[PDB]
Amino acid sequence: IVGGYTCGANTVPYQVSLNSGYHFCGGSLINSQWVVSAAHCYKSGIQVRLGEDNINVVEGNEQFISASKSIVHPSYNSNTLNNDIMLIKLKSAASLNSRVASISLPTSCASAGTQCLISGWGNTKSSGTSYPDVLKCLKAPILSDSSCKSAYPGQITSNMFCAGYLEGGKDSCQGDSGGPVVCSGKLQGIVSWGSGCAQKNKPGVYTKVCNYVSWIKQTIASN
Ligand SMILES: [Ca+2]
Numbered sequence: 001i002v003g004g005y006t007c008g009a010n011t012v013p014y015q016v017s018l019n020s021g022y023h024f025c026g027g028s029l030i031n032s033q034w035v036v037s038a039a040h041c042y043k044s045g046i047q048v049r050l051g052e053d054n055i056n057v058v059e060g061n062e063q064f065i066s067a068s069k070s071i072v073h074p075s076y077n078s079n080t081l082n083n084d085i086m087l088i089k090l091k092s093a094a095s096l097n098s099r100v101a102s103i104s105l106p107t108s109c110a111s112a113g114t115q116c117l118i119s120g121w122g123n124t125k126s127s128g129t130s131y132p133d134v135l136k137c138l139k140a141p142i143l144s145d146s147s148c149k150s151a152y153p154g155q156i157t158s159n160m161f162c163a164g165y166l167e168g169g170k171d172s173c174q175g176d177s178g179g180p181v182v183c184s185g186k187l188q189g190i191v192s193w194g195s196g197c198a199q200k201n202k203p204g205v206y207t208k209v210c211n212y213v214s215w216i217k218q219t220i221a222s223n
Pocket of ligand 1: 062
C-alpha cells in the first residue's frame with residue numbers, strides 16, 4: 001500500500017497473509033474454512049496466516065492453517081487477468097473471534113463513488129521498494145467504468161473495476177495482491193493489477209467480486 005496508514009493490530013480481522021516460507025499475497029476469510037484471493041497468487045504449499053499484524057513477530061493472535069485445496073476460477077486468463085480469483089480451503093476451521101472474523105460476500109455490486117478500505121503488506125513506495133512488517137490501510141473510492149476504461153484502453157473487462165486516485169500517490173502495490181477491497185462491510189474487490197503503483201492516471205484494478213458470488217457459493221457447498 002502506497003500512501004496509506006497503519007491499520008492498527010487486528011482492526012482488519014478478515015485479512016489473511018498467504019505464506020510459502022514468506023508472505024507473498026493477501027486474501028480474505030469468507031467463512032471459518034475458506035479464503036478468497038487472486039488466481040495470480042496460485043502456489044502449491046500455501047499456509048494461511050490469520051490474526052496477523054506484524055508478519056515477522058509472533059504477537060499472540062495468530063492462527064496458522066495449511067491449505068487443503070485450491071481452486072482457481074475455471075476461466076482465469078493469466079495474460080489478461082480476467083477472472084483473477086481463487087478459493088482456498090483450510091485443512092481445519094479457523095477459530096473466529098473479534099480479531100479473526102469473516103467478511104460478508106456482497107448481495108449487490110458497489111457503485112462508482114463508494115468509499116472502500118484496501119489493506120495489505122505490500123510495497124509502500126511508488127519508486128523503489130520498502131516492505132512493511134505491519135498491515136497498511138487505504139481508503140479509496142471506486143472510479144467510474146468510463147474513467148477506468150480511459151486509463152487502461154482495451155484492458156478492462158466487466159469483471160474488473162478501478163479504485164483509487166487519478167492524481168496518483170495512493171494505491172495498492174506489489175505484495176497486496178489477493179487482498180480485500182471492503183465497501184460498506186462487504187467484500188467487493190480483490191487486489192489484482194495496475195501499471196506500476198500510485199502513478200498518475202493509472203489507478204488500481206480490482207476483481208469485481210459481486211460477479212462471482214454464485215460461483216463462490218456453489219463451490220463452497222460442494223467442496
Ligand atoms: Ca505475527
